Amino acid sequence: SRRRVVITGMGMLSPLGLDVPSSWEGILAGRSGIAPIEHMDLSAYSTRFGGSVKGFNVEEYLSAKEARKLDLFIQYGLAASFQAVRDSGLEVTDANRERIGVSMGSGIGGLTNIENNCRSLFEQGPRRISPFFVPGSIINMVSGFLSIHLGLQGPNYALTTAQTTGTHSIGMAARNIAYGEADVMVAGGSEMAACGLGLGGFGAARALSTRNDEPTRASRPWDRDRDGFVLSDGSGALVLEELEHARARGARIYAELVGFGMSGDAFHMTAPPEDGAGAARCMKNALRDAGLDPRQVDYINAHGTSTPAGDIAEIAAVKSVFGEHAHALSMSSTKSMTGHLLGAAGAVEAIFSVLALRDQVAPPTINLDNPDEGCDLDLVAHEAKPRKIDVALSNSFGFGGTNGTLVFRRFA
């Protein structure tokens, strides 16, 4: 019968820092991680900025010989996973290695690697494709390489549900533990889609902000002057652990994972419905899963992508789920600062939701100068808001009408 699940370790690469504490410091101070991109020439592109990981040292984690074979999304996912496992204090042994698995996902996976190899194929021939093209690029290899390095023999898989990937990864990893399939899971997501095909492809869809002359102001969730999401890179990983297992080893517990919801919109390949119907269904599933009165919700880490249709759909969904309580909770988009880490968005935002509970503070939505028509909730404009948070909710929505909600609460 269903076991309880707690968070005992967290790990992160973001545009704000090379770990959790440095990233969280940036979040609470309202710092933007968004800047013109330096790693390639974007003069032919309509968007020339994003949230890069700055100064990542893969040789803090891996030998240069191994790193060379791996797409940045795998390097970022391993770095976050390694941080999370170290932060947990868990020791892997013959007695427990079969009970520890990994679910680290990605929206797009090794697009940089696949692009670079496609150039080799077309300009030279197939004889120049890397022998490591497949194991260095495909999405399941974060789970793969983490298991090989740490000796994790538990369930080993990867989700790819576009911008919902990190939330689904964490939710389904909790269900694995809930139902007895594992006692520990490393779960989250990683993304590095900032190559020609990534920026070009989202550019071709006209989905990205084109505010090239003021990149730190581009991501402006619920602001009347928003013009699309900002593309960002990195990873989040959490160690999820059955409660009694955590208790038994004297683990430091950050918070409890009490609720998970999924729903499909069944609306459109890329557009969310204006009324937020799929997002509302998803949050209701998650609150019922957690056995909660909606009035118990103190903080919501919104998806909050800075798209016209996305941002307003979320207001409508929250008002529909929470009624008059929609005016008492705080909702913010940390994407105001980090940008949109795509498959890794739900993973970093799950971590920000747990740290909101530890520190009793709602992160700000920076750049919220002129809230749009109907965006009249407490969106924590400009500045972090100290406040009582017993229950925090993290939402993600993605292409294919895919929706995820995680519910965390303080643990005593």
Interface positions, 153-192, toward a second copy (CB under 8 A): 153-162, 164, 168, 172, 175, 179, 181
Q: Which of a second copy, ligand K0V, none binds 85 (CB below 5-8 Å, type-dependent)?
A: ligand K0V
**80 lies in the binding site for ligand K0V (CB under 6 A):** no
> Cα(243)–Cα(225) distance, rounded to whole angstroms?
45
For residue 316, which phi and psi values (nearest 5 degrees)? -65, -40
Interface positions, 143-182, toward ligand K0V (CB under 6 A): 149-150
Q: Which of 263, 264, 329, 241 is nearest to 292 (CA)?
A: 329
Binding mask 199-218 for a second copy (x = CB under 8 A): xxxxxxxxx-----------
Sheet of 255-264, strand order: 156-157, 100-105, 184-191, 234-242, 5-13, 255-264, 402-409, 391-398, 299-301, 330-332
With respect to ligand K0V, which residue has the nearer C-beta, 149 or 382?
149
Cβ(347)–Cβ(80) below 8 Å: yes
Q: Label residue 228 exposed, middle or buried (CB < 10 Å: 0-12, 13-18, 19+).
A: buried
Give least dist CB 285 to a second copy, A: 9
Q: Which of a second copy, ligand K0V, none binds 339 (CB below 5-8 Å, type-dependent)?
A: none
Q: Which of ligand K0V, a second copy, none binds 86 (CB below 5-8 Å, type-dependent)?
A: ligand K0V
> Cα(409)–Cα(196) distance, rounded to whole angstroms?
41
Exactly one of 143, 305, 332, 405 binds a second copy (CB under 8 A); that residue is 143
With respect to ligand K0V, which residue has the nearer C-beta, 82 or 352?
82
Handedness of CA 127, 130, 135, 141 (dihedral sign): negative
Exactly one of 268, 288, 295, 327 binds a second copy (CB under 8 A); that residue is 268
Query: What Cα–Cα distance (Å) separates residue 161 from each residue in 25, 255, 262, 303, 400?
Result: 29, 25, 11, 14, 8
With respect to a second copy, which residue has the nearer C-beta, 88 or 117?
117
> Cα(246)–Cα(152) distance, rounded to whole angstroms?
17
Q: Per DSSP, what are the bridge partners of residue 104?
A: 188
Exactly one of 56, 82, 133, 145 binds ligand K0V (CB under 6 A); that residue is 82
Interface positions, 84-113, toward a second copy (CB under 8 A): 97-98, 101-102, 105, 107-109, 111
Interface positions, 85-114, toward ligand K0V (CB under 6 A): 85-86
N- to C-terminal Cα distance for the chain? Answer: 22
Task: Give the single-character DSSP code of 97.
Answer: G
With respect to ligand K0V, which residue has the nearer C-beta, 43 or 63?
63
**374 lies in the binding site for a second copy (CB under 8 A):** no
Contact positions toward ligand K0V, by CB under 6 A? Answer: 82, 85-86, 149-150
